[PDB]
Amino acid sequence: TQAQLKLLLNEKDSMGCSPLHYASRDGHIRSLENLIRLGACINLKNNNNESPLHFAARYGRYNTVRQLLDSEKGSFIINESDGAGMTPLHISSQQGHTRVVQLLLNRGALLHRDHTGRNPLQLAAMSGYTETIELLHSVHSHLLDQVDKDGNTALHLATMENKPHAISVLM
Amino acid sequence: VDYLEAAESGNLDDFKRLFMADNSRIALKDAKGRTAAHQAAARNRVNILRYIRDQNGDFNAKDNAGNTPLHIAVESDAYDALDYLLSIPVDTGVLNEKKQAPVHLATELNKVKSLRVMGQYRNVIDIQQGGEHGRTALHLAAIYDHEECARILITEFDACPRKPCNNGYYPIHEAAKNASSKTMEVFFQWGEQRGCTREEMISFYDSEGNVPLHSAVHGGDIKAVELCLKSGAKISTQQHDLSTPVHLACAQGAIDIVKLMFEMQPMEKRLCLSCTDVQKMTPLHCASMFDHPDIVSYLVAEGADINALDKEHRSPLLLAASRSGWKTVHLLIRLGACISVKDAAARNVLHFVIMNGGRLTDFAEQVANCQTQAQLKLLLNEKDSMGCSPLHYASRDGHIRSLENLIRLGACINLKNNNNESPLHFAARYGRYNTVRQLLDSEKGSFIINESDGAG
Amino acid sequence: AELERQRRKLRDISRMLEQQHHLVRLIVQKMEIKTEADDVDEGISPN
Amino acid sequence: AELERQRRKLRDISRMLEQQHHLVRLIVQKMEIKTEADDVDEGISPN
């Protein structure tokens, strides 16, 4: 049946998730390699325009991120937006996964704003993750005090939703 | 319900009598599973829609996603029915649930001939019409790499990419980020013939200042870069972060792109390559910060500035050692590193080796083989701002293994900081047991077992 | 009066569990050198 | 009413962890004599 019945590797469900989205969302390091080996599409996007790397960075799947990037088309997807404008450096730092944002920086994830105007340190300061603020400030020190489209800094955003541990660090 | 299977199948003069019976069933423009009489043009029923036009039916459907009568035809294959629908002055500006005009379906779905049907009319429709995020109909031909749908729009509908979206991007930016190597070709060649030229597209500004050569290395495609260099883009144009494209490459490790743009513009290697941005980092700093030991071989061979300082006063050797890239600090030493530099807290490179867990035996083995060792082991006894020599940093942080190597290489044991504290005063204070035990049974261990400090 | 049931959790983890770390470090002593543990020293970190 | 959540910490450390000390003492029985453990006796210390 295999003549050409491997189009069900790239076949979306109701929510748009192809079976490579289900691998990255739930860990499954072993079966992730087999989908890539059989030629599943890497940068295939669901109805919210999210690649599986946006799933892998969001749930903190470390080894899933690392073996998506060193395949082919890994340089194309290291800094790619979604529907909201966020790269996987925005998504991983928003959730506070420190080992993933450490991994994406060492492989040259570039920096740019999302559609709201925020850099990766605005988002990590909105949530209370004061481990990811101190990492990003040591690498890129200029993005502490630049503003989004509303003029807010990183200190306004951590004050608008009551994170007192991330104010004593930003000051 | 009678005209549902009638207008879809019969569609000529008996469906129109059945639709006269369907209007006699309840009324005309009655609801259905999809919409009111939307199934006519879905099956290319020209005469049934002509009888619907004769009875003056609705020309605006709301089929649970607001897919109108023109949008329901182009979503299917209804090439001939739209020619009557566009002869009628129907409204061509209604947006769906996904915020799409009927122009934004014929490009996003690569409906080639359905654009040509819309091209003969060309004055009842609008091409600069805001879609999803304000993406016009030429943004979506640049994202998905539909080179023929972009070929039709620019020479027939008479468009030029001067309409930014609601985030600042122009269609040359969206085609360059997404590695649309084919779609970029028709802007630079077939867009010249309208009034939006090569030298004018190449100088578009993003919401951050990104010239589309900056956006050619966000996408990491080597072919989309050389299209921007054939059209005359300089590699010196800086961002709002004052970064050049030679900063953005070399931070990715794209060795194939940094040498490509040095071949096509050999003039700029003086103006760039000494082009400190915000945070004052030369393009050699950016390649040693992220542990890329093959670009820093190339940049010095092209005449770099091997030990140029920056903000916070760090040489590229110190910058590559604070990040614990240990493959690129062995390379810089064997290439003329000038190991005497000290940053803003007077920490030299041996401070950063010990506080980052680096291996120190093979580090000193490099300086011995590079013949600097003649007498450049005075940086073993070299205090920082707080007076702490690198043997203080070993005892304060544990590091039993690297403590032996400093003693074996002849660091001074009883060397005191500004509060007159030997490293044994550090080792006893933080409870480091094995650090105390192997300071005492060395030489000068009987001299330091009972020695005071500033407080006594 | 639940404060005496705040020490029954640390009566066991400081006599069994703290010894449990020593039993397994006795095992890996005899097979292969571990790198994370036996390269730092005992005591309290400054930060 | 949190006193029932003062026994859920000792329901596990007295059935798994207290057994966990026995499993590893079963392992080191078969390789090499440990000196700290099997030279004192069971029971309660006087001090």
Curated annotation (Swiss-Prot), chains C, D:
Disruption phenotype: Eliminates avoidance of elevated temperatures along a thermal gradient. Belongs to the transient receptor (TC 1.A.4) family. The gene is TrpA1. The lineage of its organism: Eukaryota, Metazoa, Ecdysozoa, Arthropoda, Hexapoda. Homotetramer. Essential for thermotaxis by sensing environmental temperature. Receptor-activated non-selective cation channel involved in detection of sensations such as temperature. Involved in heat nociception by being activated by warm temperature of about 24-29 degrees Celsius. This is Transient receptor potential cation channel subfamily A member 1. It is found in: Cell membrane. It comes from Drosophila melanogaster. The chain holds residues 1116 to 1162 of 1197 of the full protein. It comes from the Eukaryota.
